[PDB]
Amino acid sequence: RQIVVGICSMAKKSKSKPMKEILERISLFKYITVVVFEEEVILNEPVENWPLCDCLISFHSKGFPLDKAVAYAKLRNPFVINDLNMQYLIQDRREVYSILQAEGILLPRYAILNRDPNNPKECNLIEGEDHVEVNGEVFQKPFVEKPVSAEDHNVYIYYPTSAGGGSQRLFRKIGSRSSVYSPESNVRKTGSYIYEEFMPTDGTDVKVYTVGPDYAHAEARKSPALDGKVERDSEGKEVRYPVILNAREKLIAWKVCLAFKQTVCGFDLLRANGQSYVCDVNGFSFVKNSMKYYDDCAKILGNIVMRELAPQFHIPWSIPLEAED
Ligand SMILES: O=C(CP(=O)(O)O)O[C@@H]1[C@@H](OP(=O)(O)O)[C@H](OP(=O)(O)O)[C@H](OCc2ccccc2)[C@H](OP(=O)(O)O)[C@H]1OP(=O)(O)O
Ligand SMILES: Nc1ncnc2c1ncn2[C@@H]1O[C@H](COP(=O)(O)OP(=O)(O)NP(=O)(O)O)[C@@H](O)[C@H]1O
Ligand SMILES: [Mg+2]
Ligand SMILES: [Mg+2]
Numbered sequence: 587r588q589i590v591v592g593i594c595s596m597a598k599k600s601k602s603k604p605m606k607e608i609l610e611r612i613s614l615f616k617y618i619t620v621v622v623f624e625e626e627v628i629l630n631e632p633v634e635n636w637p638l639c640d641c642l643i644s645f646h647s648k649g650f651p652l653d654k655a656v657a658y659a660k661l662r663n664p665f666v667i668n669d670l671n672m673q674y675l676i677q678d679r680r681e682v683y684s685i686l687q688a689e690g691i692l693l694p695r696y697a698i699l700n701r702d703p704n705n706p707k708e709c710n711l712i713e714g715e716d717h718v719e720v721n722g723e724v725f726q727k728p729f730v731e732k733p734v735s736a737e738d739h740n741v742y743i744y745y746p747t748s749a750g751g752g753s754q755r756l757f758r759k760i761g762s763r764s765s766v767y768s769p770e771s772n773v774r775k776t777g778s779y780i781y782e783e784f785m786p787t788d789g790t791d792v793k794v795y796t797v798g799p800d801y802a803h804a805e806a807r808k809s810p811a812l813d814g815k816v817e818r819d820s821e822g823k824e825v826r827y828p829v830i831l832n833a834r835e836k837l838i839a840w841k842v843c844l845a846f847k848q849t850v851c852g853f854d855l856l857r858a859n860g861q862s863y864v865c866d867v868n869g870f871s872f873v874k875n876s877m878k879y880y881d882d883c884a885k886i887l888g889n890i891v892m893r894e895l896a897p898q899f900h901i902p903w904s905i906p907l908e909a910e911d
């Protein structure tokens with residue numbers, strides 16, 4: 587029989603252009619059949635009624651019942667490409683940074699301000715006009731303030747008096763804009779946050795996309811922190827700049843992929859002061875508008891499936907060569 591690769595995610599993701607491009611390519615593997623789980627089934631059917639698969643590609647996004655996906659994996663024991671339990675931890679910036687630190691991965695100096703919503707003023711925060719002190723640790727402006735929820739994209743940057751003060755409020759893109767300047771110079775007074783040192787880059791973020799620990803595609807985009815106007819090409823797509831990762835960065839990708847147990851994993855790098863710092867790990871993410879990435883990603887994923895399962899299915903398989911970017 588065929589090896590069944592099940593895809594379990596919200597319809598917005600399962601029916602996205604990059605997903606469809608990759609799945610049509612995985613389907614070219616002679617012994618692989620792809621089954622995409624319907625959103626109505628994921629949401630409303632018990633896991634006992636979900637389709638069977640031998641290999642499961644499943645990931646959380648807004649509205650996704652991660653508890654059910656975990657229960658399905660426990661019930662059916664498929665080969666899991668992106669670990670499901672780690673997807674709880676990827677939703678919490680505190681957990682993400684804790685893992686990065688434990689892997690010896692360079693990241694911005696940071697401190698966690700945990701605030702009790704019942705007693706918001708009893709937390710260990712002291713504020714001056716050009717700095718904050720978080721659990722005693724001093725952050726001179728410029729510094730960055732991130733909600734502890736990794737799903738909350740309201741990241742603020744606070745400017746020093748020497749630069750005019752105020753703040754840059756970032757958010758999920760709304761059309762032409764990804765951030766806006768605010769004259770507010772004082773930090774947020776409700777919620778829990780990570781405070782971290784601002785890393786000076788050339789004005790771009792490096793976005794890294796892994797497919798297993800030995801393949802990573804990278805590209806750069808204008809930092810939303812800069813002025814907040816999104817750069818677009820004549821075709822209306824956001825401008826992307828070419829990147830080739832250095833040896834240090836290829837190792838970072840290897841580490842992130844394995845540490846979070848996410849075969850397919852996106853993360854952000856800040857190239858600053860002659861090193862590269864991880865500031866965000868997003869989990870499952872595909873590159874868009876690259877035919878070569880679609881070819882590479884599908885081949886790698888198919889090869890992973892075959893390597894793991896071909897012996898069980900008595901299918902002859904010789905491990906092929908694979909790209910690194
Ligand atoms: O960024 C994420 C989290 P993830 O990246 O885990 O999905 O979700 C966004 C929504 O942002 P919040 O996390 O709620 O702050 C966003 O809500 P707003 O409309 O309030 O900004 C918004 O959520 C709309 C929404 C989806 C599902 C149920 C209810 C609402 C957005 O969806 P879309 O606008 O890109 O379709 C979600 O991204 P997704 O594509 O689902 O990953
Ligand atoms: N410590 C830092 N120093 C300088 N710039 C930073 C720092 N942290 C974040 N940024 C910038 O702010 C942007 C958003 O921060 P990030 O931690 O990626 O938030 P996010 O809400 O998880 N974004 P997403 O990639 O959509 O999940 C980054 O892409 C950088 O341009
Ligand atoms: Mg096939
Ligand atoms: Mg990011």
Ligand SMILES: [Mg+2]
Nearest residue numbers: 736866867868
């Ligand atoms: Mg993120």
